[PDB]
Amino acid sequence: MQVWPPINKKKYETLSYLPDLSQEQLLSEVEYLLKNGWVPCLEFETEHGFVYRENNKSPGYYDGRYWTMWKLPMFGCTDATQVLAEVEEAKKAYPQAWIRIIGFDNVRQVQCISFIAYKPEGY
Amino acid sequence: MQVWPPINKKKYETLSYLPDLSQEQLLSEVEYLLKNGWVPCLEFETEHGFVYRENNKSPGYYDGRYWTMWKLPMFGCTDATQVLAEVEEAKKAYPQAWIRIIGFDNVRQVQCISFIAYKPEGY
Amino acid sequence: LTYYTPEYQTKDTDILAAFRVTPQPGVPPEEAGAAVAAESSTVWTDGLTSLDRYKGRCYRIERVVGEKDQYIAYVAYPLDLFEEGSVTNMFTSIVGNVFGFKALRALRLEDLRIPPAYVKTFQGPPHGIQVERDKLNKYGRPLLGCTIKPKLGLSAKNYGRAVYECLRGGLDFTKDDENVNSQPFMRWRDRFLFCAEALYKAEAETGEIKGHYLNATAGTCEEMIKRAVFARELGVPIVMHDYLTGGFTANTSLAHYCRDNGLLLHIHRAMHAVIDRQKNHGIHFRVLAKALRMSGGDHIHSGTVVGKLEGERDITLGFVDLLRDDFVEQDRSRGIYFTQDWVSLPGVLPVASGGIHVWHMPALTEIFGDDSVLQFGGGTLGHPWGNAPGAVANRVALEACVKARNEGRDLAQEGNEIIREACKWSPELAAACEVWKEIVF
Amino acid sequence: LTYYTPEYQTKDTDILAAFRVTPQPGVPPEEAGAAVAAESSTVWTDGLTSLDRYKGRCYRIERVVGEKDQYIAYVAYPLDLFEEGSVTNMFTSIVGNVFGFKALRALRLEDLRIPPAYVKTFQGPPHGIQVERDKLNKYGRPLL
Amino acid sequence: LTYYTPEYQTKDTDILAAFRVTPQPGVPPEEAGAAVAAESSTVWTDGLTSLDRYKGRCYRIERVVGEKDQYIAYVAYPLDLFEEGSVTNMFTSIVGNVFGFKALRALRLEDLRIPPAYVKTFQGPPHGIQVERDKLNKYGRPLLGCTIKPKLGLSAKNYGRAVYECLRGGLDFTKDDENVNSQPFMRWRDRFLFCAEALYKAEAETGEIKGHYLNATAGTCEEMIKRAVFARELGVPIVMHDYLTGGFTANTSLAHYCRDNGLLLHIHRAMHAVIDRQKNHGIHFRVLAKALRMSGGDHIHSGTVVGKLEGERDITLGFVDLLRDDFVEQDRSRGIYFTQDWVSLPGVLPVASGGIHVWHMPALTEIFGDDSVLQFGGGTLGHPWGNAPGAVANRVALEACVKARNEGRDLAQEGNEIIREACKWSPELAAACEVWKEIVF
Amino acid sequence: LTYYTPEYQTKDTDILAAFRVTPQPGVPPEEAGAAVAAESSTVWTDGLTSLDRYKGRCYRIERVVGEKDQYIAYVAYPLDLFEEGSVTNMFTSIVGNVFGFKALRALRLEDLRIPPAYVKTFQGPPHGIQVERDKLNKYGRPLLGCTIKPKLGLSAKNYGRAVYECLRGGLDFTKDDENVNSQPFMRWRDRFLFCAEALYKAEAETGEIKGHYLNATAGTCEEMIKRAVFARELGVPIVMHDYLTGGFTANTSLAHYCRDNGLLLHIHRAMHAVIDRQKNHGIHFRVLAKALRMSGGDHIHSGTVVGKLEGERDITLGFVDLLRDDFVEQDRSRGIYFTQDWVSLPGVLPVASGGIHVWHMPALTEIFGDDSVLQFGGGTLGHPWGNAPGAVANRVALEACVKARNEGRDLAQEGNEIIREACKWSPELAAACEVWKEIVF
């Protein structure tokens, strides 16, 4: 009967207790996003990829939810393969970063996606 | 007339100002636990094995009292030697960890034991 | 029969109720519906106002064919009757005197059309679905919860450890049971301190925001706010209130305290089946949750579905929408007897609860979709390998259900199978599929 | 059927309820009353307390002769379950989860024996009949 | 003799007292017990109530054979006589007028059976033994304390350093003496600031939660709460009150302040021997601690034992149980004249104090066991190598006493010997065994 | 024997106590007195202060010839030991640890010389005798009080009527018994409202200021002030506190609340005979009232005298002076072991109580004189013609005692006779002289 690790099972929310998605599984996700009408975007964190609270500890205040946007939302993108080119360019620039693909639903005025696209070495 | 060290006399409460218990002394303890009716369990800490307060400094609020449970309570264990197998398996997995044997007294609804079973190298 | 008005044209500032009346034999249906409306007024001084402005109009009576001979009488209540922003008042004025009229065998309130001009007098959810996900930074799945068990039974440090094992295993939320307030074995303020400790640890372990629905329910308004105030002192994200035993007056006060302080509110509907279970008498849960979307809560328990099946799953799906959506138009097969325009009142997240463990995952995931909380007690706690293995086990099960849906698989048919695939690559989940299959296939 | 306890002797610090249960056809009355009581607990961590102290005991089941075939199951709730001086808690702990159990057609709570040790945790009427008449100085009739 | 009632059947909502009355020569014992009960009422208006409901019944009189000719008269007081949740009232109504009756030479209150319906009107310990160990995370031994000495004498930075040396040496708790409040040499708020500093240092040195019993006792209700409030500001775990000089009204207010704020309360019983020492007059300490388990404290001084020996050790063991246990049934050899069902009021941890140093360790450890606080003044401070060596020295002595008990040795006979073994492997403890043996063997 | 100091010259900033020590056989008296003093300190850190400044000096030991072989050891305590203005501290530092020393059979505190530099740290009576008479506009006699009976028993409207009948008959004051706080039969705030009503009526009937000692005693500091606050709301003149069950911390808080709000404080000494009755152990009531003149009260019960007779009447007369006078110099026959200069702390009015009815009037009037309260329970309530006839009856009896004294008659011998004269011209008083003489002459 097993123990689940107290060390090193840092998670990046949706889809992260699954095996890492192959570019095929990542592509199908980016293609879902797109088949619902949602604009994909990439966030990349170089500096600690986990929430924390340094600035203030109030109810529902956390530091670290916001990453830097990698370029803009791919408004009117129809081909998910356009998108994977970006995960892959970002990753050149930032072998450092954790990249995540988020999506915007402008119908509901809200972000609807966030899956970790690239865990930096040994994450 | 001697001085007691300001450095490195970090303690792990009960039984830690004694010599380290030999597997014989650890076994007799685990066998006591058991002869009072108390369910043994193992806690293991990989990440700083000392209380602290980061999250909040209120009266009787401390971070670090809780460790991760190593598997479950050995409900209805009658042989203390079953138990030492667990200290010893955990220790394979976590040469890192500080392991401690705790015990549950379900008659009083309370934890009654906590002795350090394995101090990680140089503790 | 001056309250039965076939010719009334409704106003858009009218509370409309749809009462299933089962008259006493011999009450003409007309006289039955007019009787329901007439519990609005009676005369003398009446000549010093025009009672014509403060009366319920039973404008339409329909026949509930075949469910017996019952009738859906439609009453229309003027806006001026209600105190702006008071669910305690809207329930006193409607469910306050009618259900005990001699000339009625059993009457049931099925729905309410709360006009937008009344909607606007309410704060609503202190947050609601969207801000809640923004706050919590969780997108793409239903969120997961663990209910600590036993409810009454353990100490505070024990409740508190259960909490952590569970939350480090990847569930997002843990719940104080509805019965846990402050009690001889576990007094509130220590449950709060240890559940606070436990969740910050679990969150520093995962890297994901974790939180515990601390039950702020108590016996006076003052003590409820006292407990709420101490959650705020810890910086913890969510508190809890059972809104039917505590009250609508009180609920509304916890809900304005949380808006102003940034805490989320998990509302538990304990006691509701006392009012909403019987088909012929009571008030139907969809009314009891329109009352909560207005009084205020961020999560509301909607029960489970995969147990209580299709056809009745349609009225569950009727009130999840009434909860979550900005406008739920008229659909008398899902039990929406009236269109409802929520005029930008935040939605409440459905918490599905009870009977659940993993082959439920795809179905639940499908009935509810993304905007829900799947709350497991035994689905997590009753795992073979304990609490964190159970957490991981419902979680990878859910994420398998997300990925499958996302790569266009049909959870409705591939479900059981999808979970079959997942057992295979997860140790933790596999041992859950076993005890699953101690009653599964 | 570990919540149906024919042999339980009530404590004087017990909330006793008298539930008229109308079971689903086929629920044995015993299993019906034990079901009402069992909405008090369920297991695992349970070995870190004694659930035997925090459970409802359906100690007696009577037959409601002729009003249909319904039964007055008598549950006995321990004092430790309730928050002192909270009717919101006594109602959550009793009428909170039982009335919606599949194996129950319709259940009704008829009476409660609120023990004196629990009575004492309540303020009660801010005044009550007597002080009220003293205050108001009205004696000898019903008031109008 | 309408208060002497041989035929009374007690109610379970009765406060029963067991008074050892020593009548004036010539008072018939019956008339003596009825006299004790009669201090409950007298007549006229009496016809506008039924005094029969508000009178003490001396239902039984027993003969204290051979301790002289004294009698244990059993009075039974109705519940309606007492203000719910007021030890100030239960003591006014019982010990308020009877002890000064001409027809009584000397009367003594030996025990009280506080009914559960009255028990329930009390908050109790702000925490009590269990939460206290959960909070403090200490399991498996009696906890250790150091009393700073001299009490009145040093400055605040000095008190404060004593504190730290002591606490880094492995004791868990240090005490402001009962006489230390705010005084010209050492004013409160600086003692609080330096003892706060000292304990966080000692705790960051060991890794074990440390704490100082800060004496919040003062001359007004207001100043006591003022000091308490500042402990809360430091995040320190425990404060202290002498409950007999400060008062029961006040004690209860410090005790509800600490419940609501999460501070533990170490109660010191200064002044008690003024009331409880004499055998024939006063109130017996077991009554004085039932009054504290109800008014509220988390620790209570129970004195020392190994000094005052066996037979009388049985009544110590009688009230430690009355303090710590949920139900202490009737045992007239340990001085329990009545069964007591505490109906889940938290227990208070006995602090053993005075005369102690290490060959006491196994005995103390045995009289008291795990649930106690062994408080040393000189046992620690009067060590050869100073404060931290003394702390280590009582501590490894205790842990030797724990291990020996745990590997079934009999502390009662092997004790002295067990400590013999321990001296040997500890330098620090060995020098303590020397000055030990400057009066030992 | 470094605490026995034959050569010490006292400081004027010393608290001196006079302890009657009864040593264990074999303790040399010197070693006995030095032992009492030594409960002030012990050593090590002691070299970081000079313990020589913080120790009790048993400077003199006297032999209590013939009362047994007991000794009056005179300890001298430095000013620096005490917290300014705290009777809770002065009692912890003196009666806190000494009375339980093995080498003492029974020790008793007889007197305290509270230095003026310490006196000055205390508020004292919120008013005291003089302002009290100015406020109340009563001059020339002892004031009269009626104690409502039964204590626990009647309702609030009943307590309240008793009160009025009594006060319209010319008594000045009525008392809530010490046991009356808020209780199931009679809750506080209604007793307060009806006793308020009753006294304004009685006062508008007579034309004389009337008032009721409302018992503000409760179980928390907070509730005691809550009741006090409501007396203030009524504009009533006096409230009451039992200072030994409630506490000195608390007492001092009710006493500064009343100074600041202009209410008088009737202090009841319930529980005192537990500490002060035995001759060989305890604290002597004169010490227990110096503690009240300092903590604060405006009236203090001093008991009755004509019952407990001459010789012991001398120590009553010793502490009434200690209460009422600005300076009570040394008089070891009235039990003043030390001179006391009260440096303009207000005096407390003695309340004589118990056993009293009219042939007591001249004696009482003579023991006490003008500055006292003669408090009757049965002396008034137990009158034949009820409450107001009993009031008039003790009253004209007193005024006969005033006139007789004033026209130089000797109440001490003419007393019985003086009352004989008075019976004759009063109907009301005559029927009181009858039941008087059902046991008189």
The residue extents of the domains of chain E are 1-122, 123-441
Out of B61, B68, B111, closest to residue C193 by CB: B61
Which DSSP helix (H) or strand (E) runs through C300? strand C299-303
* Nearest C-alpha in B relative to D47: B106
Out of B60, B72, B111, closest to residue C193 by CB: B60
Distance of alpha carbon D1 from its chain centroid, rounded? 19
Q: Residue E264 corresponds to which tokens in the numbers above?
A: 């533990």
Alpha helices in F85-210 (DSSP H): 87-95, 116-119, 129-136, 156-168, 188-206
Closest by Cα among E281, E65, E355 to F106:
E281
Peptide linkage before C150 cis (omega within 30 of 0): yes
For chains B and F, having 3+ Cβ pairs within 8 Å is answered no
Closest by Cα among C236, C241, C229 to C202:
C236
Q: Residues of E numbered 418-437 whose beta carbons fall under 8 angstroms of chain F's beta carbons: which are they?
A: none
Is the CB of residue D123 less than 8 Å away from at least one CB of chain F?
Answer: no
Indicate the SS3 state at residue A3: coil
Which DSSP string do the residues of D72-107 spell out, in sequence order? EEEEEEEGGGS-TT-HHHHHHHHHTTGGG-TTEEEE
Q: How far is B5 from chain C (nearest CA, A)?
A: 31
CA torsion, ordered E247, E252, E256, E262, to nearest 10 deg: 60
| Contact call for residues C177 and C268 (beta carbons, < 8 A) | no
Contact between chains at F95 and E274 (C-beta distance less than 8 A): yes
- Alpha-carbon distance of C409 to C400, in angstroms, equals 11
Contact between chains at B46 and A3 (C-beta distance less than 8 A): no
Report the relative pairing of strands A110-118 and A98-105 from DSSP bridges: antiparallel
* Full strand arrangement of the beta sheet holding D70-78: D57-64, D70-78, D14-23, D104-113
Amino acid code (one letter) for E74: Y
Q: Which of E120, E294, E339, E341 to probe by mutation at the D interface, max D CB count within 10 Å?
A: E120
* Nearest C-alpha in A relative to C131: A110
Q: Between C and D, how many CB-CB pairs are < 8 A?
A: 108
User: Partners of E61 in the beta sheet?
Assistant: E73
* Full strand arrangement of the beta sheet holding B110-118: B68-70, B39-45, B98-105, B110-118
- Alpha-carbon distance of C166 to D42, in angstroms, equals 17
D87 vs C contacts (CB less than 8 Å) = 219
D117 vs E contacts (CB less than 8 Å) = 116-117, 119-120, 343
Catalytic residue among E149, E226, E256, E403: E149
Which DSSP helix (H) or strand (E) runs through F291? helix F285-295
- Which 8-state DSSP code applies to residue B4? -
Indicate which CATH number applies to the domain containing A9: 3.30.190.10
Q: Residue F127, annotated ligand binder?
A: no
Q: Residue C222 corresponds to which tokens in the numbers above?
A: 């003052």
Over the range D58-76, which residues count as b (16 or more CB within 10 Å of their CB) and which as e? Answer: bbbbeeeeeeeebbbbbbb
Alpha helices in C235-350 (DSSP H): 248-261, 272-276, 285-295, 313-324
Q: Which residues of C carry out catalysis? A: 149, 268
Q: Residues of E numbered 220-259 whose beta carbons fall under 8 angstroms of chain C's beta carbons: which are they?
A: 259
Alpha-carbon distance values, F385 to E45, F73, F432 (Å):
12, 55, 9
Contact between chains at B45 and A1 (C-beta distance less than 8 A): no
For chains E and C, having 3+ Cβ pairs within 8 Å is answered yes
For chains B and C, having 3+ Cβ pairs within 8 Å is answered yes
Report the relative pairing of strands B68-70 and E264-268 from DSSP bridges: unpaired
User: Partners of E240 in the beta sheet?
Assistant: E215, E266
Q: Containing domain of residue A102, as a range?
A: 1-123
Out of C155, C179, C219, closest to residue D93 by CB: C179
Number of domains in chain B: 1
Which CATH entry fits the domain spanning E123-441: 3.65.10.10, 3.40.50.2300, 3.40.30.10, 3.20.20.110? 3.20.20.110
Indicate the SS3 state at residue D16: strand
For chains F and A, having 3+ Cβ pairs within 8 Å is answered no
- Alpha-carbon distance of C214 to C224, in angstroms, equals 11
- Alpha-carbon distance of F47 to A29, in angstroms, equals 77
| Contact call for residues E336 and E329 (beta carbons, < 8 A) | yes
| Cα torsion A104, A105, A111, A117: sign | negative
Q: Which of B46, B61, B66, B89 to probe by mutation at the A interface, max A CB count within 10 Å?
A: B46
Place of tokens 């969150």: C203
- Which 8-state DSSP code applies to residue A116? E
* Nearest C-alpha in D relative to B38: D48
Q: Which of E80, E221, E295, E353 to probe by mutation at the F interface, max F CB count within 10 Å?
A: E221
Resolution (A): 2.5
Which DSSP string do the residues of A30-86 spell out, in sequence order? HHHHHHHTPEEEEEEESS--S-B-SS---TT--BS---EEES---TT---HHHHHHH
Within 13 Å of residue F93, how many CA atoms lie on the same side as its CB? 33
Is the CB of residue D131 less than 8 Å away from at least one CB of chain F?
Answer: yes
- Alpha-carbon distance of F146 to F174, in angstroms, equals 5
Is the CB of residue B39 less than 8 Å away from at least one CB of chain D?
Answer: yes
**Residue E149 is a catalytic residue:** yes
| Contact call for residues F73 and F5 (beta carbons, < 8 A) | no
Which technique was the structure solved with, according to the deposited record? X-ray
Is the CB of residue E84 less than 8 Å away from at least one CB of chain D?
Answer: yes
Contact between chains at C261 and A59 (C-beta distance less than 8 A): yes
Q: Residues of E numbered 49-68 whose beta carbons fall under 8 angstroms of chain F's beta carbons: which are they?
A: 49, 51, 53-54
* Nearest C-alpha in D relative to B103: D48
Q: Residue F147, annotated ligand binder?
A: yes
Contact between chains at E135 and C184 (C-beta distance less than 8 A): no
Q: Residue F54 corresponds to which tokens in the numbers above?
A: 């913080």
Contact between chains at B55 and C153 (C-beta distance less than 8 A): no
Listed as own residue / partner, the contacts of A89-98 with beta carbons closer than 8 Å and 24 or more positions apart are A90/A42, A90/A44, A90/A118, A91/A118, A94/A44, A94/A46, A95/A120, A95/A121, A96/A46, A96/A120, A97/A44, A97/A45, A97/A46, A98/A12, A98/A44, A98/A45, A98/A49, A98/A67, A98/A123
* Nearest C-alpha in C relative to B54: C200
Q: Residue E178, annotated ligand binder?
A: yes
Residues on chain A bordering chain B, Cβ-to-Cβ distance under 8 angstroms? 1-3, 6-7, 57
B109 vs D contacts (CB less than 8 Å) = 48-50
Which DSSP helix (H) or strand (E) runs through C266? strand C264-268
Q: Residue E211 corresponds to which tokens in the numbers above?
A: 């704490």
Place of tokens 């040593």: F23
Is the CB of residue B12 less than 8 Å away from at least one CB of chain D?
Answer: no
User: Partners of B110 in the beta sheet?
Assistant: B105
Q: Which of D19, D21, D44 to probe by mutation at the C interface, max C CB count within 10 Å?
A: D44
Is the CB of residue E13 less than 8 Å away from at least one CB of chain D?
Answer: yes
What are the phi and psi torsion angles at F336 (to 5°)? -90, 105
Report the relative pairing of strands C173-175 and C143-147 from DSSP bridges: parallel
C155 vs D contacts (CB less than 8 Å) = 49
| Contact call for residues C406 and C141 (beta carbons, < 8 A) | no
Closest by Cα among B121, B119, B120 to B19:
B119
Neighbours of chain C (3+ CB pairs under 8 A): A, B, D, E
What class does CATH assign to E1-122?
alpha beta
Q: Residue E22, annotated ligand binder?
A: no
- Alpha-carbon distance of F441 to F434, in angstroms, equals 10
**Residue E268 is a catalytic residue:** yes
Contact between chains at C235 and B110 (C-beta distance less than 8 A): no
Indicate the SS3 state at residue F389: helix
The 3-state DSSP composition of chain F as helix, strand, coil percent (nearest 5) reads: 45, 20, 35
List of residues 6+ apart from E45 with CB closer than 8 A: F148, F149, F150, F153, F154, F158, F162, F381
Q: Count CB neighbours of F78 within 10 A.
A: 18
Within 13 Å of residue C314, how many CA atoms lie on the same side as its CB? 9
Neighbours of chain A (3+ CB pairs under 8 A): B, C
- Alpha-carbon distance of B35 to F15, in angstroms, equals 58
Neighbours of chain F (3+ CB pairs under 8 A): D, E
